[PDB]
Design a protein around this nucleic acid. Structure first.
Ligand SMILES: [Mg+2]
Ligand SMILES: [Zn+2]
Ligand SMILES: [Zn+2]
Ligand SMILES: [Zn+2]
Ligand SMILES: [Zn+2]
Ligand SMILES: [Zn+2]
Lengths: 144, 109, 74, 96, 198, 46, 97, 48, 301
RNA sequence: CGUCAAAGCACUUUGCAAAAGCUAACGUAUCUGUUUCUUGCCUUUUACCAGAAACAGCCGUUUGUAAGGUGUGCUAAUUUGACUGUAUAGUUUUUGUAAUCU
């Protein structure tokens, strides 16, 4: 993950996108330091937020604007700058706007069911449109 | 655990008694637990889930008195259309500090 | 077969269809001081989940509800 | 090939063979080749008509053979799998 | 209208039932998935917020936090088993942690190629002898390295520094061509046909 | 006697391995006229 | 020639260029279709002769046909036990309550 | 030297990973060591 | 009233809902299969224990059919396949492919001919060695159950439309429909002689029809109420007795139903823990087989 | 390399089961504990000393099998297995010394 001055030089298309990744890292640090205003699980929601956003940025670089070479993209996934499993989920129908990967797997729930965010809002009542407790998600379903 | 297979027409099974007046409503019902009867049943997950889903939706509709919708295939998308238009747009990643900053599934209302 | 705890339908929700979990030996009976299993469910969406507080031996010797302790007859 | 392998197996026994003439030969087989050229000893030739003569050493050419009556106890001779390149059916231990 | 729509709805419901019963990836009506990996900042934030456990905000987790004392020596073994070797500046380890932040097992085993391992350690032997001969003043590290009552080091400022340089022989450009690009890696030939896989 | 002793022995021996036995059970439940009212409809539990 | 392998161990009758017929069990064939017949009988016009183990040359053979077929689960977790039927007091489908 | 006895494959770490109370990630070794030291110190303090 | 050691025998096994369990034509053996992707073989008389398991199927056994030889078994899988299992040795004989969905039902012929339907709205007839569908019939809505006549030219296919289709394999003329049902036909079974068809449908009525080239109009013989279907849309089976005078069925209301073929209910016996998928009668004695989605199969009289 | 057959394949996660039969490294590595004996130092116990026998625990390894994950495909890719696998009209078998009558 961490790169030294004497490490192998990343592929060519890296430097122009290096600064924004640096900004992502900076704010992740700030979120780590920032404390208060939530329950034991709510304070850990913004982490997944930024993480999904960062992975989506890389996904947008490759699959929507073809701004990065395939070599650089494999390098980025190998350096954990993006979550390979989350991107794999984004590449199949029904999970285009997946929030995180803990809201899809059923072994982490009380009754073996996915999260509320995975459910389309059309069949969900108006009153029970609440923030996810896993990551604060406000609706994953591809329809919305 | 009736061990003998027996035809139908002798299944009336009458109590054959004066049917005691003295029993009250709290004794009219047979039970295992103090509150009522409970016994095993092999329901597959999906059917129990979807029917419970429908009953919960019906209860919410009865409570809020707001039941003015239909159901179809294209109707699902049509219902989703207005909830989508009420929602603010999701920003574009790499726009990151205000003025169209990216917010995806976390976008509010 | 350790099947059910006795709960009245006033605090079992107005839905005829609810889901609940058990955690064996999860609490000491507040009367028996005995190891007993807990049961958690949801009365209705939007309120804090309920749970049984007394063992099966009690609420039966008292003919009472394990969660609300209102007598099951009056 | 398995047939010439059995013919080679026969050498040293007494084998009866008849040629394109119709004469049958009764003697001890001493040599055999892939062409089925045969060398024989103490042959008792029975002609097509029935005349019986005797021979001592012959070298019958293979191309003039109809069939042979191999001794019976060679029925249990092993028929080995033959690979592509191998020219003699032998037990194998490599790939094939 | 009528027949076509009614039959369409019936086929819809029947196909939904069939998909639930015999789905492509469904076990008991639900889709199957694998337990994934959370970002390391999750664990970092957990350990930062917990601190010394001197807050009532986490007062419900203390019993579990203390019960992991039973398995702590296992964590010690897994940590010491995967200590970085002299030739690597840093080593990234797959880890498994309690959501409480109670315990943290390094979930890996240090599997190496035996000839490669012996070659690397012989190289270390050469370089260490050379440096002990050439240093002429060797200042041994003091013990204990940190002051007794010093607070434990903050991970926030340990990730900003350049990791310095390790013990690495100057492998010849031509004589040691075969092993140049992978002699000092952690998983040496992981992505090449020389090893079966990850 | 063998069955009873085996059962009691397994119960006693079972008292460090992480327990992994999770599978739903469904039960058909019938309420019964607690405080008058109008009884209640049949329920089943997950 | 894969079909020819299927005739191994079958009983065969072979008509020869001479006009005779050999009947017997096939042991092994050849690329030139030299045949090895075990327990062979001779059909000389019909006269019967026991021959035994016979190797026919490829040239001698004209046609061949078969006359007879060639001479010729662990456990499970299931356990049964008697039991009776327990009548329920309800009349409703499993899903509906 | 004893010939190893037959036994089914079992491992504590996999059993723990199966539960919902344990997660997984990849971190620097020194960070994991600091975490283990801090956790052990906190545990020892809580029993004292 | 039979040779069974016990009047009622509970069979324990399988790891999920059992979907089918069919008697050997000889009446001496039978097999069972379900959602556990496994086939269990049993012994009708004696200790009633397993003598083999048929592993290798990569899907739930939606249906299976014994062979008249009582030596090979044909299994239909939910994974769009049709395997042929050698009962006496347990090896893969052949795997017939060609469908495009879950294969719902299977039937065998008096001649080595197999038939099947699947959710791809198709019916396929298979030779036991062709490994390919020699004939294919395309419909508009998915088909649910099949019945092949032992004579070998008419096939009855029931699907979503609620009307039984009769297909002549040689004729390919289909302008003859057994109308009368109003919902999904779960199962079909032909009488032993080949004159009467037993139909069960999700419209809650178990009906009986006649299978003859000629009719006096209203081919419907009679209907039976009571057998109700739940909301899980299961495929509930029906059976023909060895004498073809008692018709049997299973219902999702935890009831096994036997009728006298004259409209008079005969058996109402409960005893199941879940929806009862399949019911069958012994071809020699008065045994009735039950198969429910609760990992258990019941013996009978 | 060729033909035939069936299996999507490569990598990977988890569960279950098994691992000497013909004297031989499941692990070319290497710890701890209990019981029963014999010792060493010993004011008594734990903690110990070092040999044996009988037992267990832990760190690991291999194989079969089942259900999944990632990446590529089914408009082909790879793997596994089996194979009595090859030319050739010019003398030793397959491009006729045959017909003719007896
Ligand atoms: Mg004392
Ligand atoms: Zn979400
Ligand atoms: Zn989420
Ligand atoms: Zn969620
Ligand atoms: Zn109550
Ligand atoms: Zn109590």
């Amino acid at each position: 993950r961490l790169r030294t001055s004497r490490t192998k030089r990343p592929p060519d298309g890296f430097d122009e996108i290096e600064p924004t990744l640096i900004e992502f890292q900076d704010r992740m640090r700030q979120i780590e330091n920032t404390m208060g205003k939530g329950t034991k699980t709510e304070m850990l929601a913004p982490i997944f937020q930024l993480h999904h956003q960062r992975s989506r940025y890389i996904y947008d670089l490759y699959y929507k604007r073809e701004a990065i070479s395939t070599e650089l993209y494999n390098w980025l996934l190998k350096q954990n700058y993006a979550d390979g499993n989350l991107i794999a989920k984004w590449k199949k129908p029904g999970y285009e706007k997946l929030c995180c990967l803990r809201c899809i797997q059923t072994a982490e729930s009380k009754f073996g069911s996915t999260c509320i965010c995975r459910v389309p809002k059309s069949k969900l009542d108006k009153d029970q449109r609440v923030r996810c407790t896993h990551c604060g998600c406000n609706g994953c379903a591809s329809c919305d | 655990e009736l061990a003998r297979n027996v035809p139908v027409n002798e299944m009336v099974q009458p109590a054959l008694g004066p049917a005691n007046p003295f029993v009250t409503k709290e004794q009219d019902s047979i039970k295992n637990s103090i509150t009522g009867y409970a016994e095993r049943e092999y329901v597959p997950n999906f059917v129990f889930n979807q029917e419970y889903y429908a009953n919960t939706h019906a209860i919410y509709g009865k409570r809020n008195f707001d039941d003015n919708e239909a159901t179809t295939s294209t109707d699902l998308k049509r219902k989703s259309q207005k909830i989508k238009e009420r929602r603010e747009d999701p920003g574009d990643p790499s726009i990151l500090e205000g003025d169209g900053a990216y917010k995806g599934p976390w976008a509010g209302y | 077969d350790v099947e059910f705890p006795s709960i009245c339908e006033r605090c079992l929700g107005d839905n005829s269809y609810v889901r609940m979990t058990k955690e064996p030996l999860g609490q000491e009976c507040k009367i028996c001081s005995k190891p007993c299993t807990i049961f958690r469910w949801i009365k209705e969406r939007g309120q804090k989940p309920g749970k049984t507080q007394i063992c099966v031996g009690c609420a039966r010797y008292k003919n009472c509800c394990q969660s609300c302790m209102l007598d099951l007859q009056f | 090939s398995l047939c010439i392998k059995l013919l080679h197996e026969t050498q040293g026994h007494i084998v009866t063979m008849e040629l394109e003439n119709g004469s049958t030969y009764r003697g001890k087989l001493i040599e055999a080749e892939d062409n089925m050229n045969c060398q024989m000893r103490d042959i008792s030739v029975t002609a097509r008509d029935g005349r019986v003569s005797h021979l001592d050493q012959v070298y019958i050419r293979g191309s003039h053979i109809r069939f042979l009556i191999v001794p019976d106890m060679l029925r249990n001779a092993p028929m080995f799998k033959v690979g592509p390149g191998r020219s003699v059916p032998l037990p194998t231990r490599g790939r094939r | 209208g009528n027949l076509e729509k009614q039959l369409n709805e019936r086929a819809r419901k029947w196909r939904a039932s069939q998909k639930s019963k015999f789905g492509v990836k469904r076990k008991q009506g639900y889709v199957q998935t694998e337990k994934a990996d959370l970002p390391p900042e999750h664990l970092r934030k957990i350990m930062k917020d917990r601190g010394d456990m001197s807050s009532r905000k986490f007062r419900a987790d203390k019993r579990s936090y203390l019960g992991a004392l039973k398995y702590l020596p296992h964590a010690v073994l897994k940590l010491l088993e995967n200590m970085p070797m002299p030739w690597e500046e840093y080593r990234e380890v797959k880890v498994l942690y309690h959501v409480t932040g109670a315990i943290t097992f390094v979930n890996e085993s240090p599997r190496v190629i035996e000839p490669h391992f012996i070659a690397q350690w012989g190289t270390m032997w050469m370089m260490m002898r050379r440096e002990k001969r050439d240093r002429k003043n060797f200042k041994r590290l003091r013990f204990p390295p940190f002051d007794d009552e010093e607070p434990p080091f903050s991970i926030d400022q340990l990730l900003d520094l350049e990791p310095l340089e390790a013990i690495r022989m100057d492998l010849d450009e031509e004589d040691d061509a075969p092993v140049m690009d992978w002699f000092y890696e952690n998983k040496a030939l992981e992505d090449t046909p020389h090893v079966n896989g990850p | 006697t063998k069955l009873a002793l085996q059962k009691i022995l397994s119960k006693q021996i079972a008292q460090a391995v992480v327990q992994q036995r999770d599978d739903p059970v469904y039960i058909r439940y019938t309420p019964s006229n607690q405080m008058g009212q109008a009884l209640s409809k049949q329920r089943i539990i997950k | 020639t894969t079909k020819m392998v299927s005739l191994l161990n079958h009983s065969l009758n072979v008509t020869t260029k001479d006009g005779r017929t050999f009947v017997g069990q096939l042991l092994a064939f050849d690329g030139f279709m030299n045949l090895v017949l075990s327990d062979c009988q001779e059909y000389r016009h019909e006269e019967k002769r026991m021959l035994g183990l016979v190797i026919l040359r490829g040239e001698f053979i004209v046609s061949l046909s078969v006359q007879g077929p060639p001479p010729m689960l662990l456990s499970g977790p299931g356990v049964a036990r008697p039991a009776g039927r327990g009548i329920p007091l309800g009349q409703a489908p499993v899903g509906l309550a | 030297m004893a010939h190893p006895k037959s036994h089914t494959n079992r491992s504590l770490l996999r059993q723990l990973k199966n539960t919902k109370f344990f997660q997984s990630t990849s971190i620097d070794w020194v960070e994991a060591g600091l975490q283990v030291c801090r956790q052990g110190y906190n545990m020892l303090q809580l029993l004292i | 009233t039979s040779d069974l050691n016990v009047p009622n025998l509970q069979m324990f096994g399988h790891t999920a809902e059992v979907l089918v369990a069919r008697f050997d034509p000889s009446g001496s053996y039978f097999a069972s299969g379900g959602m556990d992707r496994q086939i269990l073989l049993w012994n009708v008389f004696g200790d009633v224990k397993n003598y083999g398991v048929l592993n290798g199927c990569k899907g739930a056994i939606t249906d299976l059919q014994w062979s008249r030889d009582s030596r090979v078994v044909y299994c239909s899988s939910s994974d769009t396949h049709l395997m042929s299992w050698d009962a006496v040795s347990g090896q893969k004989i052949r795997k017939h492919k060609g469908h495009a969905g879950v294969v719902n039902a299977l039937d065998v012929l008096k001649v080595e001919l197999l038939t099947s339907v699947s959710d791809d709205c198709t019916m396929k007839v298979w030779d036991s060695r062709s490994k390919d569908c020699i004939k294919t019939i395309e419909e508009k809505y998915p088909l649910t159950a099949v019945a092949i006549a032992q004579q070998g030219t008419q096939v009855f296919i029931g699907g979503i439309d609620g009307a039984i289709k009769i297909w002549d394999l040689r004729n390919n003329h289909c302008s003859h429909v057994l109308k009368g049902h109003k919902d999904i036909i779960t199962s079909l079974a032909i009488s032993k002689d080949g004159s009467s068809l037993l139909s069960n449908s999700m419209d809650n009525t178990v009906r009986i029809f006649d299978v003859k080239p000629f009719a006096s109009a209203q081919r419907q013989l009679q209907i039976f109420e009571g057998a109700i279907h739940g909301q899980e849309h299961n495929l509930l089976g029906v059976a023909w007795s060895r004498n073809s005078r008692f018709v049997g069925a299973g219902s999702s209301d935890k009831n096994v139903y036997v009728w006298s073929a004259t409209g008079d209910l005969r058996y109402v016996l409960p005893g199941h823990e879940g929806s009862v998928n399949h019911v069958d009668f012994h071809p020699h004695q008065d045994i009735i087989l039950s198969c429910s989605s609760d990992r258990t199969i019941f013996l009978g009289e």
